[PDB]
Enzyme design. Structure first.
Site, PDB file in Angstrom:
ATOM      1  N   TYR A   5       0.895  -1.403   0.014  1.00 23.62           N
ATOM      2  CA  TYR A   5      -0.407  -0.132   0.050  1.00 23.62           C
ATOM      3  C   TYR A   5       0.664   1.061  -0.024  1.00 23.62           C
ATOM      4  O   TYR A   5       1.465   1.335   1.082  1.00 23.62           O
ATOM      5  CB  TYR A   5      -1.180  -0.168   1.364  1.00 23.62           C
ATOM      6  CG  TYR A   5      -1.861   1.571   1.202  1.00 23.62           C
ATOM      7  CD1 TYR A   5      -2.630   1.812   0.514  1.00 23.62           C
ATOM      8  CD2 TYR A   5      -1.026   2.120   2.209  1.00 23.62           C
ATOM      9  CE1 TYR A   5      -3.040   2.708   0.402  1.00 23.62           C
ATOM     10  CE2 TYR A   5      -2.041   3.237   2.497  1.00 23.62           C
ATOM     11  CZ  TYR A   5      -3.068   3.697   1.403  1.00 23.62           C
ATOM     12  OH  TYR A   5      -2.981   5.229   1.651  1.00 23.62           O
TER      13      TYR A   5
ATOM     14  N   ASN B 279       1.669  11.005   6.251  1.00 22.56           N
ATOM     15  CA  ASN B 279       0.918  10.184   6.901  1.00 22.56           C
ATOM     16  C   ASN B 279       1.483   9.291   8.650  1.00 22.56           C
ATOM     17  O   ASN B 279       1.572   8.567   9.531  1.00 22.56           O
ATOM     18  CB  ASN B 279       1.171   8.560   7.011  1.00 22.56           C
ATOM     19  CG  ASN B 279       0.388   7.359   6.256  1.00 22.56           C
ATOM     20  OD1 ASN B 279      -0.454   6.823   5.971  1.00 22.56           O
ATOM     21  ND2 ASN B 279      -1.114   8.107   6.119  1.00 22.56           N
TER      22      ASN B 279
ATOM     23  N   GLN C 169     -18.537  27.776  59.069  1.00 15.91           N
ATOM     24  CA  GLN C 169     -17.384  26.615  57.765  1.00 15.91           C
ATOM     25  C   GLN C 169     -17.773  28.154  56.460  1.00 15.91           C
ATOM     26  O   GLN C 169     -18.543  28.857  56.058  1.00 15.91           O
ATOM     27  CB  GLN C 169     -18.835  25.735  56.730  1.00 15.91           C
ATOM     28  CG  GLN C 169     -18.566  24.758  57.319  1.00 15.91           C
ATOM     29  CD  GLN C 169     -19.257  23.000  56.803  1.00 15.91           C
ATOM     30  OE1 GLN C 169     -18.373  22.403  56.925  1.00 15.91           O
ATOM     31  NE2 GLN C 169     -20.735  23.612  55.486  1.00 15.91           N
TER      32      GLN C 169
ATOM     33  N   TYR D 272     -17.747  27.165  48.827  1.00 19.00           N
ATOM     34  CA  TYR D 272     -17.256  25.812  48.692  1.00 19.00           C
ATOM     35  C   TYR D 272     -15.929  26.339  47.441  1.00 19.00           C
ATOM     36  O   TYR D 272     -15.025  25.165  47.420  1.00 19.00           O
ATOM     37  CB  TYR D 272     -18.378  24.874  47.434  1.00 19.00           C
ATOM     38  CG  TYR D 272     -19.959  24.343  48.176  1.00 19.00           C
ATOM     39  CD1 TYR D 272     -19.362  24.620  49.547  1.00 19.00           C
ATOM     40  CD2 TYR D 272     -19.936  23.459  47.096  1.00 19.00           C
ATOM     41  CE1 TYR D 272     -21.291  23.651  50.330  1.00 19.00           C
ATOM     42  CE2 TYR D 272     -21.098  22.812  47.864  1.00 19.00           C
ATOM     43  CZ  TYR D 272     -21.668  22.846  49.024  1.00 19.00           C
ATOM     44  OH  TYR D 272     -22.386  22.450  49.818  1.00 19.00           O
TER      45      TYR D 272
ATOM     46  N   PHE E  79      -1.508   6.222  12.241  1.00 19.83           N
ATOM     47  CA  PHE E  79      -1.895   7.412  11.088  1.00 19.83           C
ATOM     48  C   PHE E  79      -3.224   8.230  12.362  1.00 19.83           C
ATOM     49  O   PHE E  79      -3.586   9.258  12.575  1.00 19.83           O
ATOM     50  CB  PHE E  79      -2.092   7.931  10.080  1.00 19.83           C
ATOM     51  CG  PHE E  79      -2.767   6.706   9.546  1.00 19.83           C
ATOM     52  CD1 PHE E  79      -4.712   6.603   9.522  1.00 19.83           C
ATOM     53  CD2 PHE E  79      -2.519   6.450   8.655  1.00 19.83           C
ATOM     54  CE1 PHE E  79      -5.080   6.151   9.984  1.00 19.83           C
ATOM     55  CE2 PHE E  79      -3.164   4.970   8.410  1.00 19.83           C
ATOM     56  CZ  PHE E  79      -5.604   4.985   8.607  1.00 19.83           C
TER      57      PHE E  79
ATOM     58  N   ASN F 247     -13.553   6.777   2.930  1.00 21.27           N
ATOM     59  CA  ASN F 247     -12.723   5.914   3.235  1.00 21.27           C
ATOM     60  C   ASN F 247     -12.447   5.874   4.548  1.00 21.27           C
ATOM     61  O   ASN F 247     -11.987   5.111   5.261  1.00 21.27           O
ATOM     62  CB  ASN F 247     -11.022   5.941   2.190  1.00 21.27           C
ATOM     63  CG  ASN F 247     -10.128   5.394   3.024  1.00 21.27           C
ATOM     64  OD1 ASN F 247     -10.510   4.178   3.042  1.00 21.27           O
ATOM     65  ND2 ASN F 247      -8.893   5.675   3.183  1.00 21.27           N
TER      66      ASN F 247
END
Lengths: 645, 644, 643
Positions: free
Chosen positions: A70, A212, A300, A303, A352, A439
């Site tokens: 290929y 690639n 307290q 947050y 790739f 593809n």
């Protein structure tokens, strides 16, 4: 701890001089950032050579024998059906077709392009690619000579098109413009000549080998992850500085709380915070503050501080895990086919595909947004007198608040930053199109996602810059506050004596002087409608009632004299201490002194007010530039000296 | 391997009978899911292990509160209100529950019993660490309610992560008349009545007890637990089915070669490829693929498309996200998520924020993106399978036909796959980016974990739908590949025998048999002797070639014309006969035989066609239900036995 | 029709010389875009029409402030600070500017001069309504700065919508040393120096003036104006090119038939279909299409795929969104975005929120979604065009070849189109959903309009990339369709004359001429006499059919001669016509101006291995032309006579 790991990244970034690329030695994200940002850092391709040569001659030999492989004797992508024996023209046709980006100038910056070049060079060292060793040497030379192609910003689904411009450079395509340093821009052939190189003619598989891979996405992700690690540690550390200025309770970071909910990032951030706040002089002031009218004050914290170790936990873990993943990609043969020359085989796969980087870039962007929200909430609390435990609204010094709106501009901007940042953090990977004649029916979009995470980090830097500036302001306000209260106490105590007030009276009035937040009356201390005088008038009625029938007329005479003496002297004493402080101590014993010194002394700033001509822009720009260029790591490392050995 | 970890989770889910709750033994996501879904599964609260710890902490809190110690939410107001002190200890706790019973039943919408019982389990487990100050007796009631299948009806929404939903469990425990409780599947009665039916009496809340009951991440962590169990099972299922896809699509198994992934060593890439290599080694379908590409070699793709070939690279981050989130969720399951944390040993009430579900929240956002990535892979694979240009011999839509004008095959499922993937991609936007400054600006950061968990759960429902359709389609393709193999042999036989009967030259015979071998049978199954369809087209060109090559020629033309006539009355019938026979074998040697056998035999299905009355719905529902209830794990464990 | 409206906008953008700023004459998005982009366009602030009302309002505010009237931001603190009173009128205003000079220059990122000058125009325009209390002299200064090309360097971020960015314009006007001003393209000096160079002195802020200068939607609305101008132009461009797509793809024009859209009467659907009907009515390419589907009719699709056939239905909501959003932005352009609103005629200051850019913010979110929709449409079309299975005869990747092994055509552009669309879809998530409670919780709702407009602007950049690629591919496809036609005639001629020379019967001849007409030429162009490719496959099949049919030796001889003479004459003659083509139906097409523009004006050619220019080189030309407005010339020519 991840803390020591990040410190290790920062030292490696500072101290590396040569990057060894040999196919065996790992390149970390710190090495990539150093290469990109420090031009004295050189690439050293160490001959590995034998492998590469074995590989490229195997490919060339097999190609010429008409073997079926290929992208060597085969068309590309959806075109692997078409075979050919036109070995070099096949490779060149690929580069021609991929030079397809457009300059909109928007481009991938030289930093990313040079990083991509390093990453491509590294992939080649594993000896799977079939590229000539001479092409690799040329990459080393271009990298060391500050030469890189101008690359269009967009076009990759992850990095054919952008890598085609690197290939274009190496083959001397005239249409490919190359940078040499920061100003010089010349066509590729002239660029090659200026550094003693000749254009290459592509051999079998060489075009594909050059294009690639995942080099651009992974390059951007590497610097992204280096920054994410530094900024994360910076955010964790500044939570301690937030606790100091806000009058927090340091128990939020107590190890037992996090032992019983043991997310590693929860334990490790809290462990850091406990160490930073241990023996804090500001935590001394905090404890003293909550011992006065204890039952009128919050038990307290809100947050944004108290919940910080729990909030940071997934963010630490995301950033650390993404770093591993990105480095795995950096140190990989991202190419196809994979040449197994030892077993006489070309293997067909998909290295790739940048999906590991892509998905983790989405996650990191969400985590970065999470860090930004934390900063936004802390900053918001700091600006509001109802939530800041004594500090003035907008951190305005005044005393005249009608013409000093303090850090209100920075506050508005913090909302604008956080809002865009939250928007940016939507995922990119959910937007996969069926591409390239169907593809590429899955594709990672890693470069697009990495670009958005980079943008998110740009915003995070703005938010950190503003937050650190605001906290330096708060340090100054807290130190001035302590000094102002002591002055009020002294004036009240000495005037109680001069006027011959009873002990019951003296103790009631001195309590008011200690209890009342000084910033609620600084604007006009002797205003009878403001909290100092209100409190004193209340105590004066209470003393008259308590001492009645145990000489009332003389007491009132003396209390009236007290008020008049206060009216002639208190303001002046308060003004003098403030004017002294402004001309130019608790921070000196704090682990955040390096940060305060850095911003105040090294960057040359001061407490913000209407008497300081420098704009908020000018102050924050200085802090931002120091975060952007890495100077901020000096006070950071100084601050963390001695942590865990 | 993660494959072994997931197999371990599946086995534990099937096999557990008692969940041990004792403060040391970890609860896994398989345990939570088993409790929720298998009512034979029971909770075992162990007194010897943790009772002493619980009672010590309980008496510590009650004593300190009575002596007027300053502790958040015991002698102190809640949230933004910590400035206010009170000695009204029991009424402080009572007032919190009243204030939190503030959800609304929309339409009805509710947290289901599975989620609510899971939360009850998780809250019970939280109490075992002895940091909460709750009475042991309350914990025993939770155990009894769990084992008796009693749980409150809970509004879906109201939590920013889980005060409002947990208050309904507290309401049940204190016998609030307005709280409705389920007993099993059929009965629902007011909370007082439910308690007395299981021999319990309503509790009067003591110091810290109201807060202890509501101050946890129990609901987000409950939903996340079943989410993570399903994500593990469906992930392994998706990975495995990539192999089945390779078999039916005529893929090249080389994509899973260990060297490719050794040089790009993301653990999820290596491990998914390892699995795939094993599944595909010596596959009988891979032999067919090999034969296929050897015929007209240079006119067929050298490489597969990405949906298969790039699958291990795609799967890698998804594997790692799902596995890392499981760890993170289980850590939360096994935590004291409460505040203040009572350190009785050192006489300290520790003020912090373990009620903050941020670890779960962010990881739910990540998993939803990973689930979306799994859906996108399935969609791309399904899409390839439906299109004849990309399916290497398979008919468009996997339509058996033979008459394609009255058989649109799995087109309905194809359209639905797009609809599923579309909604799933949308769902995967984050929830954690939508933090509002909440509760009088006290809660200026909040996890939104429950909301995020809920969306990830919805995403997994859609994934289940997508897996069901994909498996159904691949069984269809299995039947079509085996039918293809039989059909080709029949055509080859007819052409060969008729070449002899008509006394054709050896040149003609060989050239005609190559056409019968090369031409994809599904391109002419509709009308085998149609002169415009590929079989007769190939035979025609070969018949002109053999005339030209051998050029008595009049007798050769006579023999070829006799060949055409003999084919035109014998070929279709022989093909019809074998097709009918098949409708009444390479899967027998495949690792995916268990899946095929399960779908065809155990679920009683067949090849889809105009002659099968059952609708796509009827076939896919069976498969979906088997995925949903966990029956799909039997063929999966069978498929995988002997791996590593 | 919206088509006439958009043409009106294009004409106005090109024809305007002066922008009249007078408190009554509307300013359109074309006018804003023209000021921003054409430096010869000048601002004309008209005293005659509004100076009077400006001075009344100015005098009112100053006198009331001195009298100690209780008016927000005049004798009171700002935002969350409205409970604080002052009599320090000038210092109050200057403390507001000091506080808002709080942007940061990140890496350099900035609101560009185009946006800044547009924001200056919009602020000046706001002032002409006479509700602000700003001095006439300050307005005159803005006009002068605009016409002299002086503008401050403004940081990109910081606005929740436009206090911080407007504070830089105010900073320029009051001579802040820290504020940098551009003068033209290559001069940057501190604000005091820039005022000096244009004959102005630093202003000392009077009552309300600081707030008046910063308290508008000028930056959000400035970026939104050029966004909307571009969106209109690019919309019409996309709509038009759907007709060009139909021509090259061999579409059926029946999809635009008036009755289809009459019975589903969304105005954008009717109006887009009406345009498309007219573009394709006498098309030479539609004639080829009709001929194409008459050959082997029952083997070819009855319907086109959605990307063409569903285009009017798809375009409909996108047309309507962009049109309505344009109206909305112009309403904002022509508004007193300021607070308080001074009602001098009734002796009162009115406290509201005209600084809220929510109309713009929300419509920017909608438009970004619409622009993503336009991108998806272009992607789907481009995708079909690259795939031989869906292109009705065209080669894959639109590769000319003939050698397809070394010509991958527009594959690079095809990959790029997926990347463009992917990022575009991501951008289209809303910004308005991310409202934070801001500014000591005073701004508990805020529009985020500038941020949204910026994101819609970025989306339009990507749309421009996609349009440039799409048009380049369609020009490629025009050449390929024309070559196709000329090639088929050569093949028909070669087959016809060789059948004559070889003395083949009329049965044979007719069959062979059918094959030559019916087989798509691009399936065998690489090697016309390759026995395995569709031309020779069809001819071999026909030769066997004519042998069995005419059966009742020399016929086989004459056919063997035909096949041999074909491999000697055919390729050379097909090569010849192609070579000639590289060194017609478009002449009768309404899209001639586009093809002529791209090929002739931009100097391009059919793409192949023989053409050395890269796709980048070709598409950049088309993109540059779209970006600078030159594309409207071919667009307007194409649309000539449409009513």
């Amino acid at each position: 701890s991840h803390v020591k790991d990040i410190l290790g990244l920062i030292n490696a970034f500072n101290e590396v001089k040569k990057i060894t690329v040999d196919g065996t030695t790992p390149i970390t994200v710190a090495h990539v950032a150093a290469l990109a940002r420090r031009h004295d850092v050189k690439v050293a391709l160490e001959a590995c050579r034998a492998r590469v040569e074995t590989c490229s001659s195997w490919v060339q030999r097999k190609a010429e024998d008409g073997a079926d492989i290929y992208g060597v004797t085969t068309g590309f992508g959806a075109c692997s059906s078409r075979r050919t024996n036109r070995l070099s023209e096949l490779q060149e046709s690929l580069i021609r077709c991929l030079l397809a980006g457009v300059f909109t100038v928007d481009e991938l910056p030289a930093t990313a392009t040079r990083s991509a070049m390093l990453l491509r060079l590294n992939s080649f060292t594993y000896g799977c690619s079939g590229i000539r060793w001479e092409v690799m040497e040329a990459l080393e030379k271009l990298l060391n000579s500050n030469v890189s192609p101008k690359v269009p910003l967009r076009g990759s689904v992850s990095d054919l098109i952008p890598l085609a411009y690197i290939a274009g450079l190496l083959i001397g395509k005239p249409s490919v413009i190359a940078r040499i340093g920061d100003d010089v821009e010349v066509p590729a052939p002239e660029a090659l000549s200026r550094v003693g190189l000749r254009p290459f003619k592509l051999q079998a598989k060489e075009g594909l080998a050059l294009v690639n891979g995942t080099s651009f996405a992974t390059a951007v992700a590497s610097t992204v992850m280096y920054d994410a690690n530094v900024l994360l540690l910076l955010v964790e550390t500044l939570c301690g500085m937030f606790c100091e200025v806000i009058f927090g309770r340091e128990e939020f970071a107590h190890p037992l709380i996090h032992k019983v909910k043991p997310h590693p990032g929860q334990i490790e951030s809290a462990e850091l915070l406990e160490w930073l706040l241990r023996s804090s002089p500001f935590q001394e002031l905090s404890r003293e503050y909550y011992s006065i009218d204890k039952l009128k004050k919050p038990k307290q914290d809100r947050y944004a501080l108290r919940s910080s170790p729990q909030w940071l936990a997934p963010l630490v873990q995301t950033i650390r895990d993404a770093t591993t993943t990105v480095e795995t990609e950096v140190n990989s043969a991202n190419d196809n086919p994979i040449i197994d020359h030892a077993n006489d085989r070309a293997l067909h796969g998909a290295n790739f595909q940048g999906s590991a980087v892509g998905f983790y870039m989405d996650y990191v962007r969400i985590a970065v947004a999470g860090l930004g929200k934390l900063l936004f909430a802390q900053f918001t609390e700091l600006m509001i007198e109802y939530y800041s435990n004594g500090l003035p609204g907008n951190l305005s010094l005044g005393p005249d608040l009608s013409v000093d709106y303090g850090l209100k501009g920075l506050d508005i901007a913090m909302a604008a930053y956080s809002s865009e940042l939250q928007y940016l953090a939507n995922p990119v990977t959910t937007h996969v199109h069926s591409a390239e004649q169907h593809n590429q029916d899955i594709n990672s979009l890693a470069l697009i996602s990495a670009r958005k995470t980079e943008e998110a980090l740009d915003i995070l830097k703005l938010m950190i810059a503003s937050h650190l500036t605001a906290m330096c302001q708060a340090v100054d306000l807290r130190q001035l506050e302590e000094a102002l209260v002591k002055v009020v106490e002294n004036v009240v105590s000495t005037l109680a004596d001069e006027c011959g007030l009873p002990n019951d009276t003296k103790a009631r009035l001195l309590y008011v002087a200690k209890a009342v937040p000084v910033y609620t009356y600084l604007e006009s201390p002797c205003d009878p409608t403001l909290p100092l005088l209100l409190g004193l008038k209340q105590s004066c009625f209470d003393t008259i009632l308590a001492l009645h029938k145990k000489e009332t007329d003389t007491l009132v005479d003396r209390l009236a004299e007290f008020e008049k003496r206060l009216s002639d002297r208190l303001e002046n004493e308060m003004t003098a201490v403030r004017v002294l402080y402004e001309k130019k101590v608790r921070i000196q014993g704090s682990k955040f002194l390096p940060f305060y010194r850095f911003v105040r002394e090294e960057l040359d700033t001061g407490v913000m007010s209407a008497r300081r001509e420098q704009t908020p822009q000018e102050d924050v720009q200085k802090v931002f530039d120091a975060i952007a260029d890495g100077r901020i790591t000096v006070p950071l490392l100084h601050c963390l000296q001695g942590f865990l050995g």
